[PDB]
């Protein structure tokens, strides 16, 4: 197309001059490939535009002026694509083939900046999973590398978190992962234009990893942030949205209706929704119902007020940080929960005014006493 | 963390700077602060006017030279070895995005993350007419509380 | 010859008459063997002085894993007749650290697989509470995991679980004569009986203001006396609180309400502000100005 043909030649091509781009064999092969608007990732500002998703075999021809990458197009400039774009060529040996050539070239030849490649090469391996073992091992090195680093790119972690998520992505621990990816979104949050099939499907898997999180609930979340419409919409996002509904409603068969394989694939949410319903009931039962120095909630009818029954209360309510969360204790006899905090919460408008009132109340009144004492 | 000693000498001088520089609220008189920053309580020994220009008509437009600090520290070191650069001050009373630029320049010259110093040249509000910030980073910067020491020779 | 003591007795004297350890490597071997004969003897003490003297110097060797491992296994066998499992696994843990270095993890796991196992075998440990996660632990191939999952089964501990988990696990898990001397699993099981029960009481300790003996024995699957004893234990251990109440047939889990509390609590109520207004305050005006605009 114009971008490649017109851009490849005029683009750079000449950035850039008598290079391998517009060289005999060179200009042919694109023309040989196409002018047809799908292309090879076109050498600077337009390859800087072009991820172009016909596989670059200017694989070689990007790789020109890369000896000149000193004095030529120079930046990261490379895993900007290729190591990004042909990282997306999606083979097994492919990446591995250029993983040692790029990591040993842009780190040795050109070196003898790479850290973001160091992660790409390392990170990119981990897409291939190969074996969480080798992944995590150098991943944690990739992490361990990353640790001390003050790195202007989020791209490093935007590599890494995605990467480390990718690691957990192979795995459970979405408590980590979802969060880890939740981290990654907050990392992608400033930068990195992406695609929707990248956007939602991740955020899906994210929204999914909310489920295969589930959690220290959560409840409410990044759903606020533009994963929504975006994610939901529809398909399992309906669920994923309806699950957010169950993250509030907490009716089994408003959902255990909905359940197909994928969600029933982990049935443990049927426990998690009980975990929800309790906690879901609890949080507001906690957040408000007592306001009046909230604690007691003790137990049973209050615990059956979760509309989950009393002998499960004898577990669910009984369990506390055996829920991972709750504090306090049990009066078995009087059927009283002892409770304490480990409950966070939200909303606005209300105690706002109350706040300053008492706190200006003593305050003002103090001044009476607060009259002469150390003064006089 | 490293929350810091405060030097009245600094404080006063910095204001005479403000005075001397004829600085108005249109400007904030800026400069080096001195001490040794390693401890979880940093100490501020001294501090120095960085002759400077500030324009918030165009925020990022403002002028400062390091070569002071260059020439400065030499003498300062020669004056005292303990003077090692801990950070820097300005007037204030309050922050401007121009700061962050200014901030990281010292990061070149500082061991840890260097130190901002707010002053209230009008000394208005409260305990301190002062804040001291340190960049963190989504940027962060932060004020750890600080106070005066003895400095009894001063207190005398 | 079946000579035992005498055999040990001719060898009982090495450290002293013989080498001042002119060559340990030689000597340590028989120190070992003394320690070894000490076993057929049965007296650690022979082994002990030797043992306690020797091993750091193996580390102070260009450290020779064998000299560890050999001894480290004696050190185990020490620990074995000893049956002090923190210490047991602690020893393990030491050169267990060496045999990921030294051996593969694979050969090295069963140590761990026994180590945290020993840690669990131990009534508990405070380091065991640190030793809990390590990192790669649940070394992420074997299980090796229910082990730590039991370590995880702690904060949730029940003792509805006990016979369950027992039945649940004994491939080697409850069932170990290998590197642990449970002839029956009692040296796991029985020892672990209280052990779980022990830990069971902890979250129980946390989670009860009051409870009946029944509800306990209900959840605890035991007779009163046992229960009482286990109570009495940590009572006599002072590690928990309880009431000795037969008349109610109910145990106040109590509280030391005399800490005078509001001493700290109101000071903490102040600490709240010494947090809050101190914390919250510092940010706010800063915040919207940090936001500016």
Three-state SS sequence of C232-291: HHHHHHCCCCCCCCCCCCEEECCCCHHHCCHHHHHHHHHHHHHHHHHHHHHHHHHHHHHH
User: Could you tell me which residues are beta bridge partners of residue B88?
Assistant: B32
Task: Please work out, in degrees rounded to the nearest 5, the angle formed at the alpha carbon of residue B9 by the alpha carbons of B43 and B75.
Answer: 75
Contact state of A332 with C206 under an 8 Å Cβ cutoff: no
Given the structure tokens 């007296």, which residue do they identify? C43
Which of C84, C82, C23, C85 lies closest to C57 in space, CA to CA?
Answer: C23
DSSP codes, A301-316: HHHHTTTS-HHHHTTT
CB neighbours (10 Å) of residue B53?
11
Q: Do C41 and C104 belong to one domain? A: yes
Resolution in A: 4.6
C103 burial class (0-12, 13-18, 19+ CB within 10 angstroms)? middle
Same domain, C201 and C213: no
Q: What secondary structure letter does DSSP report for A55?
A: P
Output the furthest CA–CA distance in chain A (Å, rounded): 97
* Best residue of C277, C278, C286 to probe chain B, by most B CBs closer than 10 Å: C286
Backbone phi and psi for residue B124, each to the nearest 5 degrees, phi listed first? -60, -70
Cα(A184)–Cα(A164) distance, integer angstroms: 9
B89 within 8 A of B119, measured Cβ to Cβ: yes
Among the CATH numbers 1.10.30.50, 3.40.140.10, 3.40.800.20, 3.40.50.800, which is that of B1-156?
3.40.140.10
Contact residues on chain C for B141, CB-CB shorter than 8 A: 290
Contact C286 B94 (CB under 8 A): no
| Radius of gyration of the CA atoms of chain A, in A | 29
Residue of C nearest to B100 (CA): C290
What's the distance, CA A218 to chain centroid? 15
Mutation target to probe the A interface, by most A beta carbons within 10 A, among C104, C200, C210, C270 is C210
Judge if C114 and C246 occupy the same domain: no
* Radius of gyration in angstroms for the set of CA atoms belonging to chain C, rounded to a whole number: 26
CA gap A313, C230 in Å, rounded: 26
Per-residue CA distances from A32 to A9, A27, A36, A59 (Å): 14, 8, 10, 15
Q: Which of B94, B95, B143 sits opposite C282 (nearest CB)?
A: B143
**Alpha carbon distance A168, A176 (integer Å):** 8
Asked if residue C288 is part of any domain, the answer here is: no
Query: A111 in helix, strand or coil?
Result: coil
Rounded CA-CA distance A5/A35 in Å is: 6
d(CA C71, CA C78): 9
Task: Give the pair of three-digit tokens for residue A222.
Answer: 């990044």
Across the A:C interface, residue pairs with CB atoms under 8 Å apart total 43
Question: C289 to chain B: which residues are within 8 Å by CB?
Answer: 94-95
Q: Cβ separation of C209 and A329 shorter than 8 Å?
A: yes
Judge whether B144 and B128 are in contact, CB under 8 Å: no
Residues C280, C285: Cα–Cα separation, whole Å? 10
A321 DSSP β-pair partners: none
Last residue of a domain, one of C144, C177, C207: C207
User: With contact defined as beta carbons under 8 Å apart, do C193 and C162 qualify?
Assistant: yes
Structural domain boundaries enclosing C241: 208-256
Cβ neighbours around C64 below 10 Å, total: 16
The DSSP secondary-structure symbol of B83 reads: G
- Domain match, C24 and C36 both: yes
Q: What angle do CA C271, C276, C280 make, to 5 degrees?
A: 155
Q: Cα(B152)–Cα(A161) distance, rounded to whole angstroms?
A: 52
Name the residue with tokens 């003591």. C5
Interface test with C, best of A322, A326, A356 (most C CBs within 10 A): A322
Residue C146: asked if its preceding bond is cis (omega within 30°), the reply is no
C-alpha torsion A286→A290→A292→A298, nearest 10: -100
In C213-251, which positions are buried (b, 16+ CB within 10 angstroms) versus exposed (e)? bebbbebbbbeeebbbebbebbbeeeebbbeeeeeeebb
Nearest in space to B142 (alpha carbons), one of B121, B111, B106, B118:
B118
My answer on whether omega of the bond before C22 falls inside 30° of 0, hence cis, is no
CA-nearest residue of chain C to A332? C211
Provide the 3-class DSSP secondary structure of residue B54: strand
* Residues 6+ away with beta carbon under 8 Å from B75: none
Q: How many residues does chain B have?
A: 156
CA distance to A334, B90, B122, B125, B137, per residue, from B119 (Å):
60, 7, 8, 11, 23
Mapped onto helix, strand or coil, the DSSP state of residue C177 is coil
Q: Which chain C residue is nearest to residue B143, measuring alpha carbons?
A: C282
To the nearest whole Å, the CA of C131 is away from the closest chain B CA by 29
| Closest alpha carbon within chain C to A315 | C158
In a domain, C114, yes or no: yes
- Burial code (b: 16+ CB inside 10 Å, e: under 16) for A298-335 equals bbbebbeebebeeebbbbbbbbbebbbbbebbbbbeeb
Nearest partner of A139 among A153, A155, A126, A158, judged by Cα:
A126
Contact A337, A303 (CB under 8 A): yes
Of the partner residues A133, A322, A332, the one whose CB lies closest to the CB of residue C155: A322
Length of chain A: 376
Helical ranges in chain C per DSSP H: 5-11, 24-41, 44-59, 65-82, 85-101, 105-121, 126-131, 146-155, 161-168, 189-207, 213-220, 224-237, 262-291
- Give the other-Cβ count within 10 Å of A56's Cβ: 26
Is C284 contained in some domain? no
Which of C155, C203, C208 is facing A332, going by the closest CB pair?
A: C208
C134 and C93 belong to one structural domain: yes
Residue C51 C-alpha, separation from nearest chain B C-alpha, in angstroms: 44
How far is Cα A228 from Cα B29, in angstroms, rounded to an integer? 48
Q: Which residues of B touch C (CB under 8 A)?
A: 94-95, 141, 143
- Test A338 with C212 for CB contact under 8 angstroms: no
Burial class (CB within 10 angstroms; exposed 0-12, middle 13-18, buried 19+) of A376: exposed
Instruction: Look at the alpha carbons of A305, A308, A314, A316 in this order and tell me if their dihedral is positive or negative.
Output: negative
Query: Is position C3 within any domain?
Result: yes
CA-based Rg of chain B, rounded to a whole angstrom? 14
Q: Are B113 and B141 a contacting pair, CB within 8 Å?
A: no
Burial environment of residue C13 by CB neighbours within 10 A (0 to 12, 13 to 18, 19 or more): exposed
CA–CA gap between residue A209 and residue A173 (Å, rounded): 9
CA A331-A333-A334 angle, to 5 degrees, is: 70
Nearest CA in chain C to B94: C289
The Cα A116–Cα A118 span in angstroms is 5
Measure the CA–CA gap between C59 and C63, rounded to whole angstroms: 4
Residues facing residue B148 across a β-bridge: B6
Residues A56 and A90: beta-carbon distance below 8 Å: no
Tell me which of B56, B95, B103, B125 to substitute to probe the interface with C (most C C-beta atoms closer than 10 Å): B95
* Contact in structure between C90 and C126 (CB atoms under 8 Å): no
Q: Does C286 touch chain B (CB under 8 A)?
A: yes
**What are residue A42's DSSP bridge partners?**
none
CA distance C53 to chain A (A): 38
C-chain residue closest to A338, CA distance: C209
Out of A318, A321, A328, the one facing C155 most closely (by C-beta) is A321
Q: Which two tokens stand for residue B64?
A: 């400062």
User: Chain B partners of C286 at a C-beta cutoff of 8 Å?
Assistant: 143
Give contacts of B143 with chain C, Cβ < 8 Å.
Answer: 282, 286
Domain count across chain C: 2
Cis check for the bond before A73: say yes or no (omega within 30 of 0): no
Q: Which residue does chain A place closest to C160, by CA atoms?
A: A315
Mode of pairing for the β-strands spanning A330-331 and C208-212:
parallel
CB contact under 8 A, C289 and B95: yes
| Strand locations in chain A (E) | 330-331, 336-337
Q: A188: burial class by Cβ within 10 Å (0-12, 13-18, 19+)?
A: buried
Paired sense of beta strands A330-331 and B85-89, if any = unpaired
Name the residue among B55, B57, B8 with its Cα closest to residue B30.
B55
B52: left (phi over 0), alpha (psi -120 to 50) or beta: beta
Locate A23 and state its tokens.
């060289």
| Residue from A333, A337, A362 whose CB has the most chain C CBs within 10 Å, to mutate | A333
Give the burial class of C19: count Cβ atoms within 10 A of its Cβ; 0-12 exposed, 13-18 middle, 19 or more buried: middle
Decide if C42 contacts C81 (C-beta within 8 A).
Answer: yes
Q: Is C169 in the same domain as C62?
A: yes
Give the tokens for residue A86.
Answer: 């042909």
């Amino acid at each position: 197309m114009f971008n490649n043909h017109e851009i490849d030649t005029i683009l750079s091509t000449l950035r850039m001059e008598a290079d391998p781009s517009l060289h005999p064999l060179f200009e042919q092969f694109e023309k040989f490939y196409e002018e047809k608007l799908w292309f090879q990732l076109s050498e600077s500002l337009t390859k800087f535009f072009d991820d172009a998703k016909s596989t670059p075999l200017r694989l070689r021809l990007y790789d020109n002026f890369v000896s000149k990458f000193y004095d030529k197009i120079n930046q990261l400039s490379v895993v900007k694509y290729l190591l990004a774009s042909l990282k997306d060529s999606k083979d097994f040996d492919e990446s591995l083939k250029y993983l040692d050539d790029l990591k040993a070239q842009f780190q040795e030849l050109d070196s003898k900046d790479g850290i973001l490649l160091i992660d790409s090469e390392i990170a990119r391996t981990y897409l291939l999973k190969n074996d969480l073992v080798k992944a995590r091992d150098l991943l944690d090195d990739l992490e361990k590398t990353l640790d001390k680093k003050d790195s202007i790119p989020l791209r490093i972690t935007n590599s890494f978190y995605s990467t480390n998520s990718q690691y957990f992505k192979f795995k459970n621990d979405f408590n980590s992962f979802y969060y880890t990816s939740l981290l990654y979104l907050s990392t992608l949050e400033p930068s990195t234009s992406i695609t929707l099939a990248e956007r939602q499907q991740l955020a899906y898997d994210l929204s999914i990893s909310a489920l295969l999180g589930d959690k220290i609930y959560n409840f409410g979340e990044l759903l606020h942030h533009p994963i929504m419409e975006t994610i939901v919409n529809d398909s399992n996002y309906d669920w994923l949205f309806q699950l957010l509904n169950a993250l509030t409603v907490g009716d089994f068969d408003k959902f255990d209706s909905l359940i197909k394989v994928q969600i029933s694939k982990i049935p443990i949410l049927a426990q998690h929704e009980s975990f929800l319903r309790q906690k879901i009931c609890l949080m507001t039962l906690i957040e408000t119902v007592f306001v009046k120095n909230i604690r007691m909630l003790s137990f049973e009818d209050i615990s059956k007020a979760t509309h989950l029954p009393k002998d499960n209360v004898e577990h669910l309510v009984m369990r506390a940080i055996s829920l991972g969360l709750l504090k306090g204790s049990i009066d078995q006899v009087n059927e009283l929960v002892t409770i304490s905090w480990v409950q966070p919460r939200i909303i606005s408008g209300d105690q706002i005014t109350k706040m300053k009132d008492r706190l200006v109340e003593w305050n003002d009144q103090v001044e009476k006493l607060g009259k002469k004492m150390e003064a006089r | 963390h490293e929350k810091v000693t405060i030097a009245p000498l600094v404080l006063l001088s910095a204001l005479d700077h403000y005075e001397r520089t004829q600085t108005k609220e249109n400007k904030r008189c800026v400069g080096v602060i001195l001490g040794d920053a390693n401890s979880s309580t940093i100490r501020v020994t001294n501090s120095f006017a960085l002759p400077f220009e500030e324009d918030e008509k165009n925020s990022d437009v403002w002028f400062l030279d390091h070569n002071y600090i260059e020439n400065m520290n030499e003498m300062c070191k020669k004056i005292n070895a303990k003077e090692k650069l801990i950070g820097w001050y300005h007037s204030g009373p309050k922050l401007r995005a121009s700061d962050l630029k200014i901030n990281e320049l010292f990061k070149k010259y500082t061991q840890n993350n260097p130190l901002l110093l707010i002053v209230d040249v009008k000394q208005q509000g409260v305990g301190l007419p002062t804040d001291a910030y340190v960049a963190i980073e989504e940027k962060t910067f932060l004020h750890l509380p600080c106070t005066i020491e003895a400095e009894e020779a001063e207190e005398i | 010859e079946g000579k035992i003591d005498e055999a040990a007795d001719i060898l009982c004297e090495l450290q002293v008459e013989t080498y001042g350890s002119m060559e340990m490597s030689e000597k340590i071997q028989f120190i070992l063997e003394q320690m070894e004969l000490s076993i057929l003897k049965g007296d650690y003490s022979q082994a002990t002085v030797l043992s306690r003297k020797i091993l750091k110097k193996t580390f102070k060797n260009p450290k020779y894993e064998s000299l560890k491992l050999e001894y480290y296994n004696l050190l185990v066998k020490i620990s074995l007749h000893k049956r002090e499992y923190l210490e047991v696994a602690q020893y393990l843990q030491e050169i267990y650290q060496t045999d990921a270095i030294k051996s593969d993890e694979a050969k090295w796991k069963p140590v761990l697989s026994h180590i945290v196992y020993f840690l669990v075998l131990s009534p508990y440990g405070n380091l065991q509470n640190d030793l809990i996660h390590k990192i790669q632990n649940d070394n992420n191939l074997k299980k090796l995991e229910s082990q730590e999952s039991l370590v995880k089964l702690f904060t949730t501990n029940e003792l509805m679980r006990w016979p369950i988990v027992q039945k649940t696990y004994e491939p080697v898990l409850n069932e170990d004569d290998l590197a642990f001397g449970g002839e029956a699993n009692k040296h796991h099981w029985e020892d672990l009986q209280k052990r779980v029960i022990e830990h069971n009481l902890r979250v129980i300790s946390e989670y009860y203001s009051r409870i009946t003996l029944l509800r306990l024995n209900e959840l605890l699957d035991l007779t009163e006396s046992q229960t009482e004893t286990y109570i009495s234990d940590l009572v006599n251990q002072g590690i928990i609180y309880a009431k000795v109440n037969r008349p109610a047939k109910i145990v106040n889990f109590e509280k030391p309400k005399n800490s005078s509390q509001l001493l700290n609590e109101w000071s903490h109520n102040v600490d709240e502000l010494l947090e809050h207004i101190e914390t919250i305050g510092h940010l706010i005006t800063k915040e919207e100005i940090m936001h500016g605009l």
